[PDB]
């Protein structure tokens, strides 16, 4: 409360930290469904099911330009982009399976790295 605050985590390599594990999940063999935007002109659906949208590349640029405030905003984007896929795919499809795979490879690296 005023005047009253738990001792200060260090955040100063949380930037740095999320770059990095970025980076990981960018050169996985698995992440190549999620690092681009998905075309709305050409997969019938997608616009309208899918109301927030998020890729790789997204988040690399969100990263880099300050937008987000703090290490867990980064971690809901991450997540999002799995929703989205398993919304869209089913289980046992090659991309429904991608996603499975990189959802289990980031929550690993994310516990970690900073718990």
Same mark, same amino acid.
Not at 1 to 14: A, E, F, H, L, T
Not at 27 to 49: R, S
């Given at each position: 409360?005023?005047?009253?605050?738990?001792?200060?985590?260090?955040?100063?390599?949380?930037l740095?930290?999320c770059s990095?594990?970025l980076?990981?999940?960018?050169?996985?063999?698995?992440?190549?469904?999620?690092?681009?935007?998905?075309?709305? !002109?050409?997969?019938?659906?997608? !616009?309208?099911?899918?109301?927030?949208?998020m890729?790789?590349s997204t988040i690399r640029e969100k990263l880099s330009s300050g937008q987000y405030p703090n290490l867990e905003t980064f971690?809901l984007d991450?997540?999002?982009?799995?929703?989205?896929?398993?919304?869209?795919?089913?289980?046992?499809?090659?991309?429904?399976?991608?996603?499975?795979?990189?959802? !289990?490879?980031?929550?690993? !690296?994310?516990?970690?790295?900073?718990?």
């Open positions: 409360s005023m005047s009253v605050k738990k001792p200060k985590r260090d955040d100063s390599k949380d740095a930290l990095m594990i980076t990981e999940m960018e050169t996985h063999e698995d992440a190549w469904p999620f690092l681009l935007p998905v075309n709305l !002109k050409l997969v019938p659906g997608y !616009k309208k099911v899918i109301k927030k949208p890729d790789f971690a991450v997540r999002l982009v799995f929703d989205n896929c398993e919304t869209f795919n089913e289980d046992d499809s090659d991309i429904g399976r991608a996603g499975h795979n990189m959802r !289990k490879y980031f929550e690993k !690296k994310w516990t970690d790295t900073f718990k």
